[PDB]
């Protein structure tokens, strides 16, 4: 089938499956991490109509399905559904046999270890890969940045990290994990669109709210004067055509969605915000690291494609950090993919080929071997 030993870089952070080959620019198979299930009976005889719809095919039929993300906040909930996602990933979209290729998974730090361990157990026992590795999402986000020094903000669909790394060495004590991410912003956006007058309650309607969040939101550099501006005039009211008919027109909801990311008191989650978890992750580091963390602050995962979020980020960290510091919020426009791109780089290095957790070494010490080889 395949005449190569190219490593597979499979990457489900929490909300969007992206996969491909090692040593490649763009991820080959990008599709949402959903499994579908018909919530009512079928009538037409002779249709096919299996009781599983995974990936973008589920979004073709999302009107008649109960959509269900199998992984939540980076934690895999239903292992059978995630096995459907992986089966559709390798066998249908990417269309390659896992038996002949090493695999490079990704996860979050501060993960429940049964996710990592059972993920390795499914990768070796079911799909029978020859090699396997459990990559950290944020470190790979620093691999695609072309740097070896920087603090990493990625903020995927269910997790954000702010992992500081200095000169090839990470700082595991200064690590962070906040559970405020894009799915919570989608639920809050659904709540405030219910406040305006557009009632979205279905999971398919929740997917439409995610579409409105992706297309039509920005970050509000100064939230107070932007709030008074939205209360002032209708220069911020924007119409978005929903699928099948009625258009919407959003005002202050256009920028109160990512302000929740910068201020978690709107969603009532006790936290300090993104800009203070960065500053706290810098202040937990030592004294002689911090200007290298200021000049190389990376903001290159998902949920950062809101326009001007680097201006709010630099404008706020400048207010937090002491003066005469050069706050460089590195936002390369290739983000939302840079964790896969760092997967492609790290899977294509020459030094990495003796760090593979491989079979006959998996079977030697069982599934706990990941906690002694990987990290």
């Amino acid at each position: 089938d395949e005449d190569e030993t190219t490593a597979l870089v499979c990457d489900n952070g929490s909300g969007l499956v992206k996969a491909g080959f090692a040593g490649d620019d763009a991820p080959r198979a990008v599709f949402p991490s959903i499994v579908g299930r018909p919530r009512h009976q079928g009538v037409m005889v002779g249709m096919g109509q299996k009781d599983s719809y995974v990936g973008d095919e589920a979004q073709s039929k999302r009107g008649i399905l109960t959509l269900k993300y199998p992984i939540e906040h980076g934690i895999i909930t239903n292992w059978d559904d995630m096995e459907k996602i992986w089966h559709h990933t390798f066998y249908n979209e990417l269309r390659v046999a896992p038996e002949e290729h090493p695999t490079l998974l990704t996860e979050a730090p501060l993960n429940p270890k049964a996710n990592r361990e059972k993920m390795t157990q499914i990768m070796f026992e079911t799909f029978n890969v020859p090699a396997m590795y459990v990559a950290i999402q944020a470190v790979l986000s620093l691999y695609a940045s072309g740097r070896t020094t920087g603090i990493v903000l990625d903020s995927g669909d269910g997790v954000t990290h702010n992992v500081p790394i200095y000169e090839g060495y990470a700082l595991p004590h200064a690590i962070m994990r906040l559970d405020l991410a894009g799915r919570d912003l989608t639920d809050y956006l659904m709540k405030i669109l219910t406040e305006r007058g557009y009632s979205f309650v279905t999971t398919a309607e929740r997917e439409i709210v995610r579409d409105i969040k992706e297309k039509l939101c920005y970050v509000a550099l100064d939230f107070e004067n932007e709030m008074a501006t939205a209360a002032s005039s209708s220069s911020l009211e924007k119409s978005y055509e929903l699928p099948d008919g009625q258009v919407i027109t959003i005002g202050n909801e256009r920028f109160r969605c990512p302000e929740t990311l910068f201020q978690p008191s709107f969603i009532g989650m006790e936290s300090a915000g993104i800009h203070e978890t960065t500053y706290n992750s810098i202040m937990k580091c030592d004294i002689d690291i911090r200007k290298d963390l200021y000049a190389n602050n990376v903001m290159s995962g998902g949920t950062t494609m809101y326009p001007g979020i680097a201006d709010r980020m630099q404008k706020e960290i400048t207010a937090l950090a002491p003066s005469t510091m050069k706050i460089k919020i590195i936002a390369p426009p290739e983000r939302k993919y840079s964790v896969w791109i760092g997967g492609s780089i790290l899977a294509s290095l020459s030094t990495f080929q003796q760090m593979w957790i491989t079979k006959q070494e998996y079977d030697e010490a069982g599934p706990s071997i990941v906690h002694r080889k990987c990290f």
């Binding site: 691999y143 072309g146 740097r147 070896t148 294509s348 290095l349 020459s350 030094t351 080929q353 003796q354």
Partner: protein, 73 residues
């Protein structure tokens, strides 16, 4: 073992060069020589100055920022 000293996918010279070209780390020539001193100097017929091993001696007409390969010639 000269061919193997150059072409090995984990320990060869060209694998290290493809590594330094592949990853960006603000890479230079002296850092690449540092990598060759790290992983490639465990072989007998490789020869460098900062490593020790291969070779221990402080041989004249062997400068820095260079390395010797004992070829068939």
């Amino acid at each position: 073992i000269i061919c193997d000293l150059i072409e090995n996918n984990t320990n060869g010279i060209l694998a290290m060069l493809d590594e330094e070209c592949l990853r960006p780390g603000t890479v230079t020539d002296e850092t690449f020589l540092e990598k060759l001193n790290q992983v490639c100097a465990t072989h007998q017929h490789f020869e460098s100055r900062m490593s020790k091993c291969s070779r221990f001696l402080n041989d004249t007409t062997l400068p820095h920022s260079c390395f010797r390969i004992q070829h068939y010639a």
